[PDB]
Amino acid sequence: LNLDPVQLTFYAGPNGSQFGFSLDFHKDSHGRVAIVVGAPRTLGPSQEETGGVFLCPWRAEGGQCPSLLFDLRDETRNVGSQTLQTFKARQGLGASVVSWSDVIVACAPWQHWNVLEKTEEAEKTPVGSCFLAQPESGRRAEYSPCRGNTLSRIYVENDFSWDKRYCEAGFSSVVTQAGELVLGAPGGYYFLGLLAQAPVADIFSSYRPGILLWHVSSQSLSFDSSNPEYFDGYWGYSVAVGEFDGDLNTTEYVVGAPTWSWTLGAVEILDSYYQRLHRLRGEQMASYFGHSVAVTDVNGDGRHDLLVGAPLYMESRADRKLAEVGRVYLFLQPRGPHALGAPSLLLTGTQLYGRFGSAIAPLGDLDRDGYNDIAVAAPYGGPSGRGQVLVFLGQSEGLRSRPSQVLDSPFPTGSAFGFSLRGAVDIDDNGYPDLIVGAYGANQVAVYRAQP
Amino acid sequence: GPNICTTRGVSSCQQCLAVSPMCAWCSDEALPLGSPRCDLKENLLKDNCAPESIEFPVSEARVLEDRPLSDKSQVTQVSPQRIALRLRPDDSKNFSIQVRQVEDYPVDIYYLMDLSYSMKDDLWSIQNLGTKLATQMRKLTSNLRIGFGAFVDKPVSPYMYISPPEALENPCYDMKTTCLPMFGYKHVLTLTDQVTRFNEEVKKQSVSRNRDAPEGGFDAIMQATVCDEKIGWRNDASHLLVFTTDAKTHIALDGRLAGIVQPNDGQCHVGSDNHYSASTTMDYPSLGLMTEKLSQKNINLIFAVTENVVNLYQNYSELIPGTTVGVLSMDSSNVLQLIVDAYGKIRSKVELEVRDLPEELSLSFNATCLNNEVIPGLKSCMGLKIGDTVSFSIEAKVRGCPQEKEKSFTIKPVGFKDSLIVQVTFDCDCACQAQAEPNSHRCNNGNGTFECGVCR
Amino acid sequence: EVQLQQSGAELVKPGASVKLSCTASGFNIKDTYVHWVKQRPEQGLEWIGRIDPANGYTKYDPKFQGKATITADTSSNTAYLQLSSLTSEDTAVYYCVRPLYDYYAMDYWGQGTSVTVSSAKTTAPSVYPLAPVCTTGSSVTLGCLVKGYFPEPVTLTWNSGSLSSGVHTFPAVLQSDLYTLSSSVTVTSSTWPSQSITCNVAHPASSTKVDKKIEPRGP
Amino acid sequence: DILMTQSPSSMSVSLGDTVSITCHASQGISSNIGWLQQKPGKSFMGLIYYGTNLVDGVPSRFSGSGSGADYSLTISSLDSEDFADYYCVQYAQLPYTFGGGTKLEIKRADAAPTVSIFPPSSEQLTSGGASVVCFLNNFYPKDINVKWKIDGSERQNGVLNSWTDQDSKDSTYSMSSTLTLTKDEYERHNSYTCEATHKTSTSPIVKSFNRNEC
Ligand SMILES: *[C@@H]1O[C@H](CO)[C@@H](O[C@@H]2O[C@H](CO)[C@@H](O[C@@H]3O[C@H](CO[C@H]4O[C@H](CO[C@H]5O[C@H](CO)[C@@H](O)[C@H](O)[C@@H]5O)[C@@H](O)[C@H](O[C@H]5O[C@H](CO)[C@@H](O)[C@H](O)[C@@H]5O)[C@@H]4O)[C@@H](O)[C@H](O[C@H]4O[C@H](CO)[C@@H](O)[C@H](O)[C@@H]4O)[C@@H]3O)[C@H](O)[C@H]2NC(C)=O)[C@H](O)[C@H]1NC(C)=O
Ligand SMILES: *[C@@H]1O[C@H](CO)[C@@H](O[C@@H]2O[C@H](CO)[C@@H](O[C@@H]3O[C@H](CO[C@H]4O[C@H](CO)[C@@H](O)[C@H](O)[C@@H]4O)[C@@H](O)[C@H](O[C@H]4O[C@H](CO)[C@@H](O)[C@H](O)[C@@H]4O)[C@@H]3O)[C@H](O)[C@H]2NC(C)=O)[C@H](O)[C@H]1NC(C)=O
Ligand SMILES: *[C@@H]1O[C@H](CO)[C@@H](O)[C@H](O)[C@H]1NC(C)=O
Ligand SMILES: *[C@@H]1O[C@H](CO)[C@@H](O)[C@H](O)[C@H]1NC(C)=O
Ligand SMILES: *[C@@H]1O[C@H](CO)[C@@H](O)[C@H](O)[C@H]1NC(C)=O
Ligand SMILES: C[As](C)(=O)[O-]
Ligand SMILES: [Ca+2]
Ligand SMILES: [Ca+2]
Ligand SMILES: [Ca+2]
Ligand SMILES: [Ca+2]
Ligand SMILES: [Ca+2]
Ligand SMILES: [Ca+2]
Ligand SMILES: [Mg+2]
């Protein structure tokens, strides 16, 4: 209802850096809110693309931001009659960023890795890696759970089981309230996809520079499968956490598998041991059902509801014609030992090729009426195709079909305005939660403030 | 009471014919001076004018070239080919023309070959299908044009093997064998009627190799659709795009695994080297964008896929309306039937046009089409198959008498090489004008000449 | 708390085989490489090999190829080392080892398993009192000689443990397949022979307990 | 295989000293080195991994350094519990190889041994054997040599020697030496001698008896 579209703030990164590809609010020990922005095509210090991360302090006038510094030097280690190698060129540092407590986790899903042993190798592949930073102390740590030291031939002899070479760890990411980092790795197990989880504290305490292959004893990875429904499913393209089984002592995970079962797509709700609690199947092949997932209670009953996005959904129209517009599916959580059912609401985009449901952000209670609200992005929506973000307010009955407010892109064509989104944090301390929108195509982030 | 022939000056035989087609001149010198010489032929015969001496030109049509219509080098589709029309002042005459669709309809087939390593065992099948398409559809239509291209996937990690360095030129390096370098999409042979050459190049093709089962064939479908001049699709021709594969396919938003986020622009990016240049920088196309461009360029997609993925592509087919699916196998019958069936659905029209019609002449038409009903004032039939014949009756009317005396025009069906050339002569004089007799004899007052029984 | 719990001491015969075990406590054996290491007093530490219990794959020093077979069982969270064709060179202490963080490191060690390769039969020790030679100083040293016993150990005390200060009980030494050990105790001359100093030797394996009062030598 | 040469093999040091043990590889191992501690009669504890990183729980007074083929472990301000054996291990290549070890030993003033000679006991002599035992007790430093003479002639074969570890109280060493010979031969000679040689004197300490004499 009330985000100010006139009084925006713009934060800018370097040309061609994709500043705004990912973002999050980060709060320091004192309590001051800043904005973490990922910029996965930022040039490194040797003019080669490595990606980068920026920490922006809140200013009404916005502007440039300091670079949260990370080690962009490749590493080599000759140990145990092998040669371990990291490759940070084109790694896409900041393709995902997430904040937890006083920690920032920025990931490079296309960081490559190889192990040489005489004339053999593991193969130079994108295992992915996450860089962890603690701004107020300077501490750095890394996490790269898919790195192995198994040679190519052995995978072949074992029919490519437990093949983590193409994980792209940190493609998606989320952190629980307790401090468990959960990474989506959609290239895991020969492109089925997997999840890796580990406590943030343990990542820091087990990491030393130059080791490259090390143990995080408390880590837990998901499982490989011979079920063809999972092949090429990109399970972990998106990830999120919530409470979906009544037991508050446990945390449930929501995983996006947008090409699951021959491109039908799926989202799964899992316990923290990775046992399936529920599966939500996509509606239409190639719709990318599971591109986005969002967890928030919108109907005010204290039970987390689930939102799933299928940005390439094609709507039926006059004379048997289909029209790619995108769709978002709302699933309200019922009471008792009852699973998620059919959707309570379908929100369909209106602009052709708009990719409505490309991103879904919980906003918190934007107008303080009691019900939490969400924002949905159509990165190429609006009459002009410049991009659009639509606010839907919560009510007793779920969400409204009619958006309360539409935010048109202030940037030019190709900005991908809305491709990334974050809310539910009051950046200016006025008592109302605000919204940050990324437009990686324009190398900028826009901050919208909520008002009485 | 009186007619237009008698009551209009009529000094000479020539002026008599100029008045109206129904007029006839009497040359008989035995006729009395009371009787008029320019009158209806009935009146002259009734007024004792010698039947031999009446001048009364009749307009006619003569078939000069009348070769029959062809069945199944020359190929005659219009008959007759040349008529001679002789018209008198202000008169008209009618004639017939027949038109038949004999020549075969134009069809373009462009063939996309999945040349990823999974197709090693299917290579013979796609070579057999390609060459049986070329050969058998050539029998079905002599105006076939056929060409092809190949695809693997986006040549970028993780789809591409990028180590050891030797693996780039030889993706099969770690298998101790050799295959070709990986590539997105290669246009190989532009749509051509050189069928033997098409078959030769198709048989030269060999496989490459990449890492992940789903391939980049949709990139090939998009560029095969939107690259007008490269592929070489003809304007007024049936367009069939035949797509082969033995596996799943990548779709829009997959590209993010290779770090590709830019959406597909639906434009041609196949330049001089014949490679899809946006392969490594642009995402796979969505179904909707494929559908749009296919519809815009009037191309019919046929998925020729192996049995293990028919259900997959049958399901994509329902989301891209008009698309059809056939089974790729060692036998080529299934897929060929879809093409034969598509050819069977083609229908054409015979629409007559007139070139070089004189100012003085004007035509009217009656069309007798497949319904065997004379639609008057109509000069086009629609819904013809190969072998069907339609018929038109044309009527030409001259305005007065022109001084040119010999003109010609053409009636030609739109899209047909064949034509009817009509040669028009204008017969405005009388036969007795040839017998001029320069000297007066009877006038003898400096008048001179004596034709058809009259002075100046 | 990570802890590797190895199986007990082994007394085995030459030419036979033995299988030592190492059970993970406070972690899963499949978490890391598990290594086996041999230690001998003179020759030092020798690396035998390793296993990745997750998949069973092994590596060995060529020196132990064919003698040592490392295995693991994730059901019982245990790694094993089997030595065939036991020789006298296999008499050693054996350790299982694993890293803390670094995949390749050697940070946590089991308590050690002792292996003794011998053909000797269980033999009780002869115990002999050692009184001094025939003038007297201010201190006097007495002794006890324990000879020809197998296997180790023996426990030796003086006055049933009452006399502990001024004692030197030397490590046993092997001669002709049986062990020998000695002990000395020094006291003030006023103490002995005026007060009774007795040697106490026990050999659990032979179920023998012998006492020898040190008596002064006669004329 | 890579040869790990460790130095020194032992050092005599005091509480509060700062000491270093060094380890030389036969080739570059680029910090792929571990340091280990074994206390008397105990198993091993890891001190350092990858050259400089302390294993969790290890006191800050241990530190690693070096590069290429040459590395050092430094203990600053020795605690009583630091008197133990220490080893390096490399894992740059398989097979993993160990250094020979360094033993830390408590330094103290030199002390001469107290030598005592004991003839065969009567029980042994009835049984048909004859062992002459000699104790060299509470000496420092640890190196010592014993020589046996029967009637002035040096007797070499059939001698067993055993040394105690450094004493917990006075930090001295002791040694036992037993000459066993046949009773037959024993009763053919009068004079039996054990001679101790130690750095505390230029001439040896000689203890003797004459068979059957009081
Ligand atoms: C395209 O096809 C059409 C259809 O066949 C064809 O049209 C003919 O065109 C010619 C001239 O080019 C017409 O000829 C003229 O006819 C005039 C009188 O016609 C009347 O009588 C006809 C016969 O009547 C009997 O038979 C019919 C059918 O059996 C029956 O229904 C009647 O009851 C009766 O028994 C009759 O068909 C005709 O009807 C047509 O016209 C009327 C009037 O507009 C219309 O209402 C009808 O629906 C119908 O279309 C009509 O009743 C005749 O007077 C005339 O003669 C004068 O002019 C000529 C010069 O032009 C002079 O020579 C003469 O001196 C006179 O001044 C002339 O003969 C013929 O009638 C047409 N036929 C029809 C059915 O319309 C075209 O030729 C074709 N075009 C081409 C390029 O091939
Ligand atoms: C191409 O597209 C087709 C058609 O959409 C897909 O085939 C369908 O696959 C769906 C799964 O997505 C199947 O759904 C199942 O239907 C069962 C009942 O169907 C009956 O009727 C059909 C004819 O219409 C018969 O042929 C069939 O044998 C059945 O008798 C249900 O019993 C199933 O329920 C179970 O699973 C669902 C989750 O999927 C749970 O919610 C239920 O509790 C239960 O466990 C299920 O609904 C359907 O049968 C298929 N239809 C047809 C016509 O075959 C293809 O898979 C697709 N191919 C590719 C490659 O993408
Ligand atoms: C980005 O590039 C454009 C030209 O394409 C240029 O006008 C602009 O200055 C660049 N932006 C920055 C911040 O340098
Ligand atoms: C959650 O459950 C685990 C084991 O089931 C238990 O150890 C833990 O204490 C529980 N937490 C709370 C807050 O009850
Ligand atoms: C032409 O019109 C005439 C009228 O004289 C008619 O009799 C004849 O059937 C028509 N012929 C053709 C070929 O159209
Ligand atoms: C993924 As392949 C074996 O068809 O190159
Ligand atoms: Ca729970
Ligand atoms: Ca709810
Ligand atoms: Ca609200
Ligand atoms: Ca606010
Ligand atoms: Ca195949
Ligand atoms: Ca592929
Ligand atoms: Mg393939």
What lies within 8 Å, CB to CB, of A265 at 6+ separation is A257, A258, A259, A281, A282, A285, A287, A288, A289, A290, A310
Task: Specify whether D51 is located in the same domain as D137.
Answer: no
Looking up tokens 């639509």 gives A390
Q: Look up residue A83 and give its amino acid.
A: T
Q: What residue owns the CA closest to ligand 5's atom 6?
A: B94
CB atoms closer than 10 angstroms to residue B60: 13
Q: Which ligand 5 atom sits closest to the C-alpha of B96? A: 13
Question: Is any Cβ of chain B less than 8 angstroms from the Cβ of A277?
Answer: no
Q: What method did the depositors use to determine the structure? A: X-ray
User: Under an 8 A CB cutoff, do D53 and A77 touch?
Assistant: no
Nearest to B365 by CA among B406, B397, B400: B397
Q: Mark whether A and C touch (3+ CB pairs within 8 Å).
A: yes
Peptide bond into D141 cis (omega under 30): yes
Length of chain B measured in residues: 456
- For the CA of A246, the nearest ligand: 7
The answer, yes or no, to whether any atom of ligand 6 lies below 6 A from the CB of B118, is: yes
Is residue C175 classed as helix, strand or coil in its secondary structure? strand
- Residue C147's φ and ψ, nearest 5 degrees, are -130, 140
Classify B58-101+347-456 by CATH class. mainly beta
Spell out where chain B is interrupted, by the residue before each break (C to N > 2.5 A): 72
What is the four-CA torsion angle of A253, A258, A261, A262, rounded to 10 degrees? Answer: -170
Quick one: closest CA in D to C105, which residue? D49
How far, in Å, CA of A384 to CA of A386, rounded? 5
A250, two tokens: 């446990």
Which residues in C lie closer than 8 A to residue D196 (C-beta atoms)?
Answer: none
How far, in Å, CA of C27 to CA of C52, rounded? 15
Tell me the residue range of the domain where D141 lies.
108-211
Task: Specify whether D88 is located in the same domain as D5.
Answer: yes
Identify from B118, B261, B262 which residue to disrupt to test chain A contact, counting A C-beta atoms within 10 A and taking the largest count.
B261
What lies within 8 Å, CB to CB, of A285 at 6+ separation is A262, A263, A264, A265, B315, B316, B319
Task: Specify whether C35 is located in the same domain as C77.
Answer: yes
CATH code, domain carrying A287: 2.130.10.130
The fold adopted by the segment(s) B1-57 is ligand-binding face of the semaphorins, domain 2 (3.30.1680)
Looking up tokens 């060493």 gives D173
Q: From the CA atom positions of chain C, what is the Rg in Å?
A: 23
Specify whether the CB–CB gap between D63 and D49 falls below 8 A.
no
Length of chain A measured in residues: 452
Q: How many domains, in total, are found in chain C?
A: 2
DSSP 8-state assignment for residue D171: -
CATH code, domain carrying C180: 2.60.40.10
CB atoms closer than 10 angstroms to residue B106: 17
First to last CA, chain B: 28
CB atoms closer than 10 angstroms to residue A369: 13
User: Under an 8 A CB cutoff, do D121 and C134 touch?
Assistant: no
Specify whether the CB–CB gap between A170 and A108 falls below 8 A.
yes
Nearest to C117 by CA among C142, C94, C146: C94
Chain A, 193-252: which have a CB under 8 Å from a chain D CB? 208, 210-211
Exposure b/e, C164-198, CB count within 10 A at least 16 = b: eebebbbebeeeeebbbbbbbbbbeeeebeeeebb
Peptide bond into C193 cis (omega under 30): yes
- Give Cα B385 distance to the centre of its chain: 13
Which residue among B153, B209, B309 has the greatest number of ligand 6 atoms within 8 angstroms of its CB, and so is best to mutate? B209
Q: Helices B123-140 and B333-344, interaxial angle, to 10°?
A: 30
Specify whether the CB–CB gap between A12 and A62 falls below 8 A.
yes
Task: Specify whether D13 is located in the same domain as D36.
Answer: yes
3-state secondary structure string, A377-439? EECCCCCCCCCEEEEECEECCEECCCCCEEEECCCCCCCCCCCEEEEEECCCCCCCCEEEEEE
Which residues in D lie closer than 8 A to residue C111 (C-beta atoms)?
Answer: 43
- Give Cα B291 distance to the centre of its chain: 27
The answer, yes or no, to whether any atom of ligand 1 lies below 6 A from the CB of B362, is: no
CB atoms closer than 10 angstroms to residue D146: 20
Specify whether the CB–CB gap between A131 and A93 falls below 8 A.
yes
The residue among C60, C92, C119 that closes a domain is: C119
- Residue D35's φ and ψ, nearest 5 degrees, are -115, 140
- Residue D103's φ and ψ, nearest 5 degrees, are -105, 120
B236, two tokens: 């007024």
Burial of A73 (0-12, 13-18, 19+ CB in 10 A): exposed
The answer, yes or no, to whether any atom of ligand 5 lies below 6 A from the CB of B393, is: yes
Nearest to B213 by CA among B327, B116, B328, B305: B116
The residue among C84, C119, C154 that closes a domain is: C119
> What are residue B390's DSSP bridge partners?
B99
How far, in Å, CA of B173 to CA of C190, rounded? 92
Looking up tokens 């030097």 gives A73
Specify whether the CB–CB gap between A312 and A326 falls below 8 A.
yes
Looking up tokens 């999050």 gives A24
Question: Is any Cβ of chain A less than 8 angstroms from the Cβ of D125?
Answer: no
Q: From the CA atom positions of chain A, what is the Rg in Å?
A: 21
Q: Mark whether B and D touch (3+ CB pairs within 8 Å).
A: no
CB pairs under 8 A between A and D: 19
Angstrom distances, CA of residue B2 to CA of A132, B6, B24: 117, 7, 15
Is residue A30 classed as helix, strand or coil in its secondary structure? coil
Specify whether the CB–CB gap between D5 and D23 falls below 8 A.
yes
Task: Specify whether D38 is located in the same domain as D79.
Answer: yes
Task: Specify whether C34 is located in the same domain as C55.
Answer: yes
Q: Look up residue B342 and give its amino acid.
A: A
Q: How many domains, in total, are found in chain A?
A: 1
DSSP 8-state assignment for residue B215: B
How far, in Å, CA of A54 to CA of A427, rounded? 17
Specify whether the CB–CB gap between B126 and B150 falls below 8 A.
no
> What are residue C39's DSSP bridge partners?
C45, C93
Strand order in the sheet with C18-25: C3-6, C18-25, C78-83, C68-73
Quick one: closest CA in B to A358, which residue? B253
Looking up tokens 């006191």 gives D59
How far, in Å, CA of B151 to CA of B215, rounded? 8
Burial of A280 (0-12, 13-18, 19+ CB in 10 A): buried
Residue D135 half-sphere exposure, CB side, CA atoms within 13 Å? 28
Angstrom distances, CA of residue A29 to CA of A103, C76, D115: 10, 46, 72
Beta strands at D85-90 and D33-38: parallel, antiparallel or unpaired: antiparallel
Domain-wise residue ranges, chain B: 1-57, 58-101+347-456, 102-346
Beta strands at C34-40 and C92-98: parallel, antiparallel or unpaired: antiparallel
> What are residue A407's DSSP bridge partners?
A389
Q: Helices B123-140 and B195-204, interaxial angle, to 10°?
A: 170
What are all long-range contacts of A249-256, with beta carbons under 8 Å and residues at least 24 apart?
Answer: A251/A176, A251/A177, A251/A178, A251/A180, A252/A277, A253/A182, A253/A195, A254/A293, A254/A295, A254/A306, A255/A184, A255/A193, A255/A195, A255/A293, A256/A172, A256/A184, A256/A290, A256/A291, A256/A292, A256/A293, A256/A308
Is residue D91 classed as helix, strand or coil in its secondary structure? coil
User: Under an 8 A CB cutoff, do A215 and C104 touch?
Assistant: no
User: Under an 8 A CB cutoff, do A213 and C32 touch?
Assistant: no
The answer, yes or no, to whether any atom of ligand 5 lies below 6 A from the CB of B92, is: no
The residue among C99, C119, C139 that closes a domain is: C119
Chain A, 68-87: which have a CB under 8 Å from a chain D CB? 77-81
DSSP 8-state assignment for residue B422: E
First to last CA, chain D: 63
The residue among D107, D138, D165 that closes a domain is: D107
CATH code, domain carrying D98: 2.60.40.10
Burial of C44 (0-12, 13-18, 19+ CB in 10 A): middle
Peptide bond into B285 cis (omega under 30): no
How far, in Å, CA of B435 to CA of B427, rounded? 16
- Residue B221's φ and ψ, nearest 5 degrees, are -60, -40
The backbone region for B139, taken as left when phi is positive above 0, alpha when psi lies in -120 to 50, beta otherwise, is: alpha
Strand ranges (DSSP E) for B78-196?
Answer: 78-79, 82-87, 92-100, 107-114, 144-151, 185-192
Angstrom distances, CA of residue A203 to CA of A127, A175, A206: 17, 13, 6
Specify whether the CB–CB gap between B153 and B212 falls below 8 A.
yes
- For the CA of A7, the nearest ligand: 10
How far, in Å, CA of C134 to CA of A9, rounded? 107
Quick one: closest CA in C to D89, which residue? C106
How far, in Å, CA of B346 to CA of B383, rounded? 9
Exposure b/e, B267-301, CB count within 10 A at least 16 = b: ebbbeeebbbbbbbebbbbbbbbbbbbbeebebbb
The answer, yes or no, to whether any atom of ligand 6 lies below 6 A from the CB of B117, is: yes
Q: Helices B310-319 and B287-297, interaxial angle, to 10°?
A: 70
Is C81 part of a structural domain of the chain? yes
Which residues in D lie closer than 8 A to residue A210 (C-beta atoms)?
Answer: 31, 50
First to last CA, chain C: 65
How far, in Å, CA of B151 to CA of B183, rounded? 7
Specify whether the CB–CB gap between C114 and C127 falls below 8 A.
no
User: Under an 8 A CB cutoff, do A114 and B286 touch?
Assistant: no
Tell me the residue range of the domain where C133 lies.
120-214
The three-point CA angle C34-C36-C38 to 5° equals 160
Residue B314 half-sphere exposure, CB side, CA atoms within 13 Å? 8
Task: Specify whether D81 is located in the same domain as D120.
Answer: no
Tell me the residue range of the domain where A285 lies.
1-452
Identify from A191, A234, A355, A417 which residue to disrupt to test chain B contact, counting B C-beta atoms within 10 A and taking the largest count.
A191
Q: Helices B287-297 and B217-226, interaxial angle, to 10°?
A: 30
Specify whether the CB–CB gap between D196 and D204 falls below 8 A.
yes
Angstrom distances, CA of residue B49 to CA of B8, B33, B64, B342, B420: 20, 12, 36, 71, 42
Beta strands at A373-378 and A359-364: parallel, antiparallel or unpaired: antiparallel
Is C219 part of a structural domain of the chain? no
B135, two tokens: 């050969």
The answer, yes or no, to whether any atom of ligand 1 lies below 6 A from the CB of B366, is: yes
Specify whether the CB–CB gap between C52 and C71 falls below 8 A.
no
The answer, yes or no, to whether any atom of ligand 2 lies below 6 A from the CB of A214, is: no
Report whether CATH 1.10.287.130 matches the domain B102-346.
no
Strand ranges (DSSP E) for A124-192?
Answer: 129-134, 139-143, 172-175, 180-185
DSSP 8-state assignment for residue B53: G
How far, in Å, CA of C191 to CA of C139, rounded? 9
